[PDB]
Amino acid sequence: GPLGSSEDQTAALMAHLFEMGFCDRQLNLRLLKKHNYNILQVVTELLQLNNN
């Protein structure tokens, strides 16, 4: 079917995370690869690290 997904989408996702309160492109990258690009899981997983 498709030839390939736009990897540029990752940049848009990163920006949404930075607007919250993380500013860690490294942590975001290692999280995105953990759930095969899942912004919903990344944000909630990161929150479980610093919610106190």
Binding site: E19, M20, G21, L40, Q41, V43, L47, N51
Partner: protein, 76 residues
């Protein structure tokens, strides 16, 4: 005081909340228009979680503040 809620879909919802408005009630003000369950509704403020049993004042939420809304869907 009006505040803004930013969704992952790139939507900015405006809400009218009071200083004594509990986070749980805020979710209700979203539930009626969005239809999304409060239990699934997760609000992020400055990279921090908002407890349902806390008030806006607990997280120094003022006027025109932007709250992020993320949902953790479960499959199996």
């Amino acid at each position: 005081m009006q505040i803004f809620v930013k969704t992952l879909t790139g939507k900015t919802i405006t809400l009218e909340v009071e200083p004594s408005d509990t986070i749980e009630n805020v979710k209700a003000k979203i539930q009626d228009k969005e239809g999304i369950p409060p239990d699934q509704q997760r609000l992020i403020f400055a990279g921090k979680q908002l407890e349902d049993g806390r008030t806006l004042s607990d997280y120094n939420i003022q006027k025109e503040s932007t709250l992020h809304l993320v949902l953790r869907l479960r499959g199996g």
